[PDB]
Write a protein that binds this ligand. Structure first.
Ligand code: HEM
Ligand code: HEM
Ligand SMILES: CCN(C)CCc1cc(F)c(F)c(OCc2cc(C)cc(N)n2)c1
Ligand SMILES: CCN(C)CCc1cc(F)c(F)c(OCc2cc(C)cc(N)n2)c1
Ligand SMILES: C[C@H](O)[C@H](O)[C@H]1CNc2nc(N)[nH]c(=O)c2N1
Ligand SMILES: C[C@H](O)[C@H](O)[C@H]1CNc2nc(N)[nH]c(=O)c2N1
Ligand SMILES: [Ca+2]
Ligand SMILES: [Ca+2]
Ligand SMILES: [Cl-]
Ligand SMILES: [Cl-]
Ligand SMILES: [Gd]
Ligand SMILES: [Gd]
Ligand SMILES: [Zn+2]
Lengths: 403, 402
């Protein structure tokens, strides 16, 4: 019942004892494995998760079964008996946010999990204070290009009340507009959110990197359109160290990866608005965002500019073009002094995280398909590491869009 | 409902209704997925046999016919009398093609219908086994115009040992464990190399020494057979524009021929059934030559390329690996040996998936194995959700016979 986990580059074996704690079920069954799928599908309820989280917390601080332990238990009981929900102590909030990141199986950057700035926004009312909470977050996390991990936790879900929601999937998004020639100008990923902005007031630009407004939702109100100050949104124009024409392509990306549409769950509590940010790995921008066929899809453009032989796959023009786009990314972020990490350094750090986590708690939930980079997969050590994927709590989950 | 499967490049949705027919269970549970792990009797045989027979008569559009009814009765009776049965010749050809069609980790399955099946079920010795393998190698190589083939040796039966090919492939380079602790040659082949020496083989000292075969007739120790050099087509590796690349002395062989998997058809088990197709360049260029535990040439090549190998952010590893794949493809094309690059191979597999959705309503596929080891998201299969499950007929891993 303890999975044997091998690394094939080295031969080392470990055993994942932690997978036995898997609180929730994943998509897989003995009959078929669905690990590749992106989205893979009363008061007595809330108590058992909430109780289980508090032991987690007090065990984490080497003070379990203690007087302070037993007092928080009867606190949350009576809180839930008197309100139907309960409130986290701020330190429990900090712990639960770090753990939820630590528990994310698809995040290659969890070497950084113990270093996360948590901003408590649980006292937030209305969308304007949302916007102010978000702008501080952005300015702290951006830090003039010396990026720092942060999360801002808005009021938890509670009965009878609506919900705090950020309609945008990220804090910084480029618009995608449809033409009558059928294509998209800008980021195809953001077509739907883009028209929602136009339909909620926004007047549309017409560039390929038009930063979107924020559609912020306070409980039981329609979302409100907010514009981010350009001086707030740090961007990196892309150039290549030796291909002088690359700059002319006009490519650019933003500094801050800030995911704003996932639900944060701690101890049976649910925070549908808790945006979190780190820094980018280069492949996210220069491979997926720019070269996915359903994203900016620039790979052929670049290949033409390199005078590559695009009429035969076996010249590997796609591979050569992709490598240079990633080199462009890394060189550009370093030139602008914006924190970036290349896929080799990142995956070597994740391996260190695996080792640390094997000692800390007997394993690490890891989703091989998302951990292995989208270029040079087998050139990184995570390709040769067997992984075990399971769901622990506290956690980040996807959720339905608000509309 | 069955698993809903999305292609993210196109937006399209399919439902893998075929997975509901999966028999032998895989290693995942609702509590934990292990899709990334490399290695994770009368009435039993009848249900296996009858389902296979049904698959056979379905394929030839004669399901429920008289011949179909009678063949089931015939199989049932033989199992009753003897505890086992024999495939008809046409069932063996069809079974072998279905085992390939069912292999979730094979990206070259667009070809599954084009498979030469050599029936060696009347094989009786290791010498005859060697002759069958040489004929297979000769046919499949075809002087570089590679043809997919499988040779099926006698099935397992009670009271008699198995035929086994001890080698993992028909062509494998020696891996000599060095007195340092290093390896000269292919480190993946240290074990089989040591068993060849121990069984009489006088070893070489090169990095690309072709191993002899150890062939196991039933209830015998393995016997050693040297492949005739002229039967083993090899490609010197050179680079189209990096002329020093030739001086690295690198070579690979032409024929990928897997010899240590068990072929299972209708409950019957063939422990020796070596099969071959042609290479996808990344198998050679990326895995065999650049894996750290294989030939591990990445740093040497990059150094020779005058790349800045002291910071990872130059992406010296990616650039050298690309040129090594370029060299492989260039060198096989120059030698006129069939080979397929990872873009063409993955594009053909998308066609296969679409065909199988129409033919059977699904297709078992191992995403981690189908996505190539370089340029993953540049290929279309990266953005294709897949469902992984076991159908029969199948090629299965089996314990090493020693
Ligand atoms: C600090 C630098 C970080 C790096 C380099 C990094 C890297 C990555 C990458 C490459 C992914 C895959 C995302 C995709 O492919 O679209 C990912 C996913 C994820 N990250 Fe991290 N990350 C970082 C910080 C964080 C932080 C601070 C948090 C939360 C506090 C976090 C939580 C997550 C979650 C929940 C996912 C899964 C989302 C999904 O399913 O796409 N990450 N990370
Ligand atoms: C004709 C061209 C073919 C191509 C291009 C091709 C391609 C591939 C590749 C790249 C792999 C991954 C192997 C690895 O990385 O270890 C693979 C696996 C596999 N191939 Fe194919 N193949 C071909 C022919 C065949 C044939 C003729 C058969 C059987 C009759 C076959 C059966 C398999 C099986 C069973 C696996 C899975 C092995 C495992 O699980 O390790 N292939 N194939
Ligand atoms: C290519 C497909 N991708 C764009 C899917 C979109 C997506 C969904 C999601 F829920 C995510 F958390 C996500 O995280 C990107 C990310 C987040 C953080 C904090 C750091 C880094 N470095 N990166 C990205
Ligand atoms: C890199 C590690 N890997 C190569 C392990 C070796 C291996 C194991 C295995 F079970 C296989 F089926 C295998 O077949 C590769 C193959 C087979 C055929 C018929 C065609 C092609 N083109 N390729 C190769
Ligand atoms: C279908 C497939 O799971 C999908 O393309 C996955 C594969 N691996 C990934 N890996 C990362 N890091 N990000 C992704 O979006 C994906 N997408
Ligand atoms: C641990 C991991 O599953 C293992 O290295 C797999 C990953 N995917 C693969 N895919 C293919 N085609 N070939 C392989 O050898 C592997 N190795
Ligand atoms: Ca029109
Ligand atoms: Ca008979
Ligand atoms: Cl992103
Ligand atoms: Cl191989
Ligand atoms: Gd030019
Ligand atoms: Gd040259
Ligand atoms: Zn699974």
């Amino acid at each position: 019942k303890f999975p044997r986990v091998k690394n094939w580059e080295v031969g080392s074996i470990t055993y994942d004892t932690l997978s036995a704690q898997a609180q929730q079920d994943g998509p897989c069954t003995p009959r078929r494995c669905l690990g590749s799928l992106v989205f893979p599908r009363a008061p007595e309820q809330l108590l058992s998760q909430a109780r289980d989280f508090i032991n987690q917390y007090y065990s984490s601080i080497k003070r379990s079964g203690s007087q302070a332990h037993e007092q928080r238990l009867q606190e949350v009981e009576a809180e839930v008996a008197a309100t139907g929900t309960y409130q986290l102590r701020e330190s429990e909030l900090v712990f639960g946010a770090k753990q939820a990141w630590r528990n994310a199986p698809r995040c290659v950057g969890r070497i950084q999990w113990g270093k996360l700035q948590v901003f408590d926004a649980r006292d937030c009312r209305s969308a304007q204070e949302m916007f102010t909470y978000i702008c501080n977050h952005i300015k702290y996390a951006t830090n003039r290009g010396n990026l720092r991990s942060a999360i801002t936790v808005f009021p938890q879900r509670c009965p009878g009340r609506g919900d705090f929601r950020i309609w945008n999937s990220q804090l910084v998004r480029y618009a995608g507009y449809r033409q009558q020639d059928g294509s998209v100008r800008g980021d195809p990923a953001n077509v739907e959110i883009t028209e929602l902005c136009i339909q909620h007031g926004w007047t549309p630009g017409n560039g390929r990197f038009d930063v979107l407004p924020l559609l912020l939702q306070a409980p039981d109100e329609p979302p409100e359109l907010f514009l981010l100050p350009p001086e707030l949104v740090l961007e990196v124009p892309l150039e290549h160290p030796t291909l002088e024409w690359f700059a002319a392509l006009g490519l650019r990306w933003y500094a801050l990866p800030a995911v704003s549409n996932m639900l944060l769950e701690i101890g049976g509590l649910e925070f549908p608005a808790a945006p979190f940010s780190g820094w980018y790995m280069s492949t996210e921008i220069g491979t997926r965002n720019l070269c996915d066929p359903h994203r900016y899809n620039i790979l052929e453009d670049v290949a033409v500019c390199m005078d590559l032989d695009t009429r035969t796959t076996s010249s590997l023009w796609k591979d050569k073009a992709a490598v240079e786009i990633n080199v462009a990314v890394l060189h550009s972020y370093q030139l602008a002094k914006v924190t970036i990490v290349d896929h080799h350094a990142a995956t070597a750090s994740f391996m260190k995280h695996l080792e640390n986590e094997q000692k800390a708690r007997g394993g690490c939930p890891a989703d091989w398909a998302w951990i292995v980079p989208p270029i040079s997969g087998s050139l990184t050590p995570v390709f040769h590491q067997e992984m075990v994927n399971y769901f622990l709590s506290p956690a980040f989950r996807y959720q339905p869009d608000p509309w």
